[PDB]
Amino acid sequence: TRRPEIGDKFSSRHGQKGVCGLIVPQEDMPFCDSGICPDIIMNPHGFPSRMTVGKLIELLAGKAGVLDGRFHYGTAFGGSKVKDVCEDLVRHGYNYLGKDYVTSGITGEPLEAYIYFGPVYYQKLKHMVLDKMHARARGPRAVLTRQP
Amino acid sequence: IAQLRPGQEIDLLMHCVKGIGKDHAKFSPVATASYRLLPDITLLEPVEGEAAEELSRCFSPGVIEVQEVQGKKVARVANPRLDTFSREIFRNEKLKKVVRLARVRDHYIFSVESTGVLPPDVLVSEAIKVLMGKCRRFLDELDAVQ
Amino acid sequence: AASQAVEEMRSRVVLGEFGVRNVHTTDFPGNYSGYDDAWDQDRFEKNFRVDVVHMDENSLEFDMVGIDAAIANAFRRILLAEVPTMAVEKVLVYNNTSIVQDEILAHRLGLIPIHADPRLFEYRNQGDEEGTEIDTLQFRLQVRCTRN
Amino acid sequence: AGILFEDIFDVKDIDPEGKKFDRVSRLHCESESFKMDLILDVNIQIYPVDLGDKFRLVIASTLYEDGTLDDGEYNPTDDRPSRADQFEYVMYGKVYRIEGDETSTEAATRLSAYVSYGGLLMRLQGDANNLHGFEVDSRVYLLMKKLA
Amino acid sequence: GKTPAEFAKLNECPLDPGGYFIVKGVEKVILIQEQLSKNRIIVEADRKGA
Amino acid sequence: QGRFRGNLSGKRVDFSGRTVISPDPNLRIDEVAVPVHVAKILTFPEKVNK
Amino acid sequence: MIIPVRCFTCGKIVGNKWEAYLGLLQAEYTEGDALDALGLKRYCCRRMLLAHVDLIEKLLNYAPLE
Amino acid sequence: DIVERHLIDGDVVLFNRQPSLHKLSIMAHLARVKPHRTFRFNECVCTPYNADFDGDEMNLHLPQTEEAKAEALVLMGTKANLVTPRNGEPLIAAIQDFLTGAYLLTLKDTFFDRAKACQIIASILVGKDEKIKVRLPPPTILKPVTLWTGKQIFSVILRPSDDNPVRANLRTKGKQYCGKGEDLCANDSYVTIQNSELMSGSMDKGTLGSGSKNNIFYILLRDWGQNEAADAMSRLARLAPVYLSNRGFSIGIGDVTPGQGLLKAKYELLNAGYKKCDEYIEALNTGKLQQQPGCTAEETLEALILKELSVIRDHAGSACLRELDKSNSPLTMALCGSKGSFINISQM
Amino acid sequence: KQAMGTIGYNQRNRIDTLMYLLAYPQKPMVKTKTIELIEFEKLPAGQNA
Amino acid sequence: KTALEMVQAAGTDRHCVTFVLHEEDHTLGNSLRYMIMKNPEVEFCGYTTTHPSESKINLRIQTRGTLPAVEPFQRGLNELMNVCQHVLDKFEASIKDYKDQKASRNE
RNA sequence: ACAGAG
Ligand SMILES: [Zn+2]
């Protein structure tokens, strides 16, 4: 049984692959007004030079589909539109673009910009660091060339 | 916990101990504990008639009421606590200049949802005795050095 | 009025369309001209009050007028991560034969809450693998599955 | 005294190139007594300035009116009578660039002085007999109160 | 031709697609090859330009 | 994989390590965080003197 | 494989709501009504029941039995 | 006798990434043992190795002789290889979230009170700077409130105490410099550092980042030694996440949505370009086309269509940037040059 | 092709050289029709974060 | 076993000192910074965690005149303990008041 | 001999 740690590669189902860098407690997370503090904080610098808007719509569609028990389709060349998931968030009291008012968790004072909450389907990849760490001081050598 | 088929058996022996929540998250006494500030929606200009109907749908369903004084609907704030701040008054172009959405800084609304270990009146009473018990620990490390 | 803007700067957290302004906490001595923001115990003990607005089993909602963010956040963090409870840390397995693994069964039994009051017990010392009357409990799960 | 410059100024513009920011405007003013134009960045959140206002701008080398140059660290807390008790807006920066005027090929007297209030700028451009005492790397208080 | 409750007596998934062999214990797949069409006049250039 | 490219000009060395990397800005720009499992293996001959 | 005991984001006990969730889908509810009748307010608790696959009911069919 | 001790804090160890293009693909660092299972280094060194932290592996080589230690520490040090040997441009410099965070710190809108200024400045007091007196600078605004503009808080990085002999001087253009201001520009984009106090202008990539010269760390490297340019990068990598993770900086689908000012210009520009391309198609197929010199009749048409279809992209992308508000996230990340460009905003 | 998940319904009676499983898999929240056509959401690979 | 360690500045006699509070986090550090900054004899006060593996905070205090920086630290601890005492008393009074006023309804 | 990873 392996538990995730610093060095385990996660994915994003859009090509925004990434290793873990830091594991913070629940108390040091930012949090909403409802008490939801996120699992996986993601850097917003991946998006301009890679132009994944599909993650920005998967997040919003999943958020508008968990509040009323649907599975919004993300079918290629079609699917659930943006104008139909913006109206399911306002009906349940959230913002129409996902951006939420966030009180921070270290200082206790609210953040200036709004932060963009929603569920994204992250998958765990097989490249773990416990099967890639490796260190040789001196050991067995080859027979023909006396080198490791 | 598990789910069995005939011929399969589970026998074990658990050992509960005492631990803080910083160690592992199975010691956290609350489901989630959080807070928010208290809103004070204020009306800078009077919103009367049919514009008070497109104001009381740009908020939570119990905060803005519409009442009549002369057979004409005028809107006032009624209970600004219940708002969740979806900020739908900024999609409405005519009504951005008649509100000032804000938060009162020195007024917090806590929410403590216990998991069933002990009721949440004692949880907050225990949480203050720990912050009282952190300031007592370093007062006895100034008196021991000096 | 400029004094109206100074008063709104230190008493309200406004929410604009694009960002939340006046996020920080400013009432410290020296930050304002005519005001006195040094520590005064009588003014804090006069302005503070607690209003309990909802309570039943396993829920509580109340107010704290007068405290600042750096103490309400401290209370939230002590509730999340520094109030102790009772939970399973050892599982001693005799004949697990099911399809649920042993580590997953130990994990699922780790998360079940226990009704024991944690003010009566004490911490188990470093080591001390047996456990005594003072600092542990002991449950026993035994389920055998047959036919009807 | 310690006054370097003192004149009454009338505002003639607020934002020539649009409102680039939220808290800072760009006052383009012009004197009555002498012939001085004046670029000035103020903080319009704490101190709002309209389009037809008329203020009295004093630039001083020190804030204590006897002429005492004792300034190694400014204490914000102490209440001792200074020059600032007659004004409404005080800044503190450093003169960093004295510049000749390239709008005349010969026989000119216009000298520009640049003061930077830690990112808030001020060009004070006029005749070279009025700007006496502005040296490079000197630190000056701006002082400013509106009139009727 | 089997029902999903009869894959249980063979220890096999209803969703395992198939198309693969079993040789000495391992699962081996003959992959799809991609070849040019035979009996067709290819009119092409030489290295020297002809 | 001959002698002159495989065993003479570049050859397999010891006292080495290879692990996945991860960011940390709390170190200086001339530091590197070696794990404990690699630091227990990679040793250095420290000659004894006064 | 089986329903997890706690929600991952906040920590509400979810893993006893599953047999009630399927029982309220036996009585012809929509899922948005069953998740409100179980008391799940926040959406992180709602995705624990809304997105869960029950693999143990179909892994136990291949398990050895007398 | 020879004791073969474990690797401990302060040893010189080499550090390698496997495709080794130039000589800064292998440098020597000072190891410091930490319990988790990765190699870890400051993100200012992601530019020489070209690593990206996405399942990326790197090699390690511990020297075994004292002479191999001294040839690795003096020749192959990170503080002695801050510039590339190619043209002399700095490579170890700021990267993303240290350019965006320092850009938003040095804008003119940010005004800190005494508590948050002390809190942001107090983050750098770890390392070899735990012993210094912090030298909080005097406040800008005094009478109505007491405020610190963020350029002072950034200038703490260049001179964090009264005994540091650093005097940095820099005077260059920004990125969004309008061409006619020279320290009075409307964009506030003309950098002036005088005696290590930031006097005017925000901090772009071309002042803190790994691009080219007029870098303030390159100014410290050429004027005040190697160590003073390497202490300031640690202060920046320490200070900018503390401000950025407590300001808040997010992106969203409302940061790339087109408003009403674009969905009317796009339609007219597409119609104009499509009608001119249809006219050139009709003028090629059924008669006279005024042939460009040096090409055939069809290669002339290609130049006119690639002219007209590049008018639609440029006049449609200069119509989205006029309706984006400030504090847009890709617009901020394109003005400071950290990640992205204007073509990416105008393309998505 | 490398995400951890579940192989099939016989993933426990199976002895392979190497097999990676996930503890609590969840089916996706935003899904293509191809997912319904190849029955991916009967045995998924990933968790909603 | 020692949870407090005073590291003074190299050039100043006891009015610039970096308190190292072992086995703590942002919790005590933020509240103690808030109660030290309400003292008008303190010019600078702010904490930083050293490294997230290590549970420490470097609380730096610099006073204005000649007083040592042990006195605002101790006054911050005492005033924070008094604030928590009064909060506990008011909260217990309000819990007993709600439990008493609901016990007189529906009876 | 093949598949991966950067
Ligand atoms: Zn939850």
Side-chain angles (χ1 to χ4, degrees), chain A residues 54-76:
Chain A
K55 182 175 289 298
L56 296 177
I57 301 171
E58 183 191 6
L59 192 149
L60 194 70
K63 183 180 179 181
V66 292
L67 295 171
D68 53 355
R70 288 187 181 95
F71 288 156
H72 287 285
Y73 288 98
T75 310

Side-chain angles (χ1 to χ4, degrees), chain D residues 20-24 26 41 46 74 84 87-88 90-92 96-97 116-119 121 123 137 139, chain H residues 108-109 136 138-145 147 149 151 171 183-187 194-195 197 199 326:
Chain D
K20 296 290 186 181
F21 298 106
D22 287 329
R23 294 179 180 90
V24 179
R26 182 66 64 88
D41 284 328
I46 62 170
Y74 179 73
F87 290 91
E88 292 177 354
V90 173
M91 293 186 288
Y92 170 59
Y96 72 101
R97 185 178 175 89
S116 176
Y117 298 102
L121 298 170
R123 178 175 70 190
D137 291 331
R139 295 180 181 272
Chain H
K108 196 182 287 184
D109 278 326
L136 183 63
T140 296
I141 303 168
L142 274 73
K143 179 65 185 295
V145 291
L147 292 176
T149 311
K151 294 187 180 69
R171 185 176 175 87
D183 206 2
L184 288 174
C185 62
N187 289 319
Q194 178 171 355
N195 289 318
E197 291 180 353
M199 305 297 283
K326 62 182 180 292

Side-chain angles (χ1 to χ4, degrees), chain A residues 36, chain G residues 7-12 14 42-46 48:
Chain A
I36 293 166
Chain G
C7 176
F8 295 162
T9 296
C10 67
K12 186 175 176 65
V14 181
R42 299 180 298 273
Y43 59 90
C44 67
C45 294
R46 291 171 68 91
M48 291 297 166

Side-chain angles (χ1 to χ4, degrees), chain J:
Chain J
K1 67 179 178 66
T2 300
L4 175 59
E5 182 178 1
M6 294 176 66
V7 174
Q8 296 177 358
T12 59
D13 48 355
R14 291 189 298 273
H15 62 87
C16 305
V17 61
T18 304
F19 296 99
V20 178
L21 300 170
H22 293 285
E23 195 65 29
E24 288 295 329
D25 52 354
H26 304 285
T27 300
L28 182 60
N30 195 4
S31 297
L32 184 56
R33 186 190 64 85
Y34 178 71
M35 296 304 292
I36 289 168
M37 287 296 290
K38 300 286 281 188
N39 192 3
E41 296 294 327
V42 174
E43 188 181 0
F44 181 79
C45 184
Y47 64 96
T48 179
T49 60
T50 300
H51 188 76
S53 295
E54 294 175 352
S55 296
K56 292 190 289 184
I57 47 176
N58 296 115
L59 186 62
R60 177 69 68 92
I61 297 170
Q62 292 184 352
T63 63
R64 295 186 186 274
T66 61
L67 75 158
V70 185
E71 295 176 354
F73 184 76
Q74 186 175 0
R75 183 175 288 173
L77 294 173
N78 290 122
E79 288 175 351
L80 183 54
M81 185 176 70
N82 292 319
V83 165
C84 294
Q85 183 71 44
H86 186 75
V87 167
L88 178 62
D89 292 332
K90 296 298 289 294
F91 179 75
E92 289 180 353
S94 295
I95 290 297
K96 185 177 74 174
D97 183 75
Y98 184 72
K99 286 184 177 180
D100 197 2
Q101 291 299 110
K102 192 173 75 175
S104 67
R105 290 181 182 270
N106 297 115
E107 291 293 327

